Amino acid sequence: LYPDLSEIKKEYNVKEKDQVEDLNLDSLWE
């Protein structure tokens, strides 16, 4: 329940992932 209580930690926690998953599900598909 409630927010992620992060939403600027999460996005910070995701931006780092939203920048790598590619190189795993896009870097080896290239």
**What are the sequence ranges of the domains in the chain?**
1-30
Q: How far apart are CA 21 and CA 2, in angstroms?
A: 27
Method: NMR
DSSP 25: T
Q: Rounded to whole angstroms, how far apart are CA atoms 24 and 30?
A: 10
Helix (H), strand (E) at residue 11: helix 11-14
**Does residue 10 contact residue 4 with C-beta atoms inside 8 Å?**
yes
Terminal-to-terminal C-alpha distance of the chain: 39
User: Quick count: other Cβ atoms within 10 Å of Cβ 6?
Assistant: 11
Which residues, including other chains, have CB under 8 Å from residue 13's CB and lie 6 or more apart?
6
Q: How far is CA 19 from CA 1, 2, 3, 24, in A?
A: 27, 27, 23, 10
Tell me, rounded to whole angstroms, the distance of Cα 2 from its chain centroid: 20
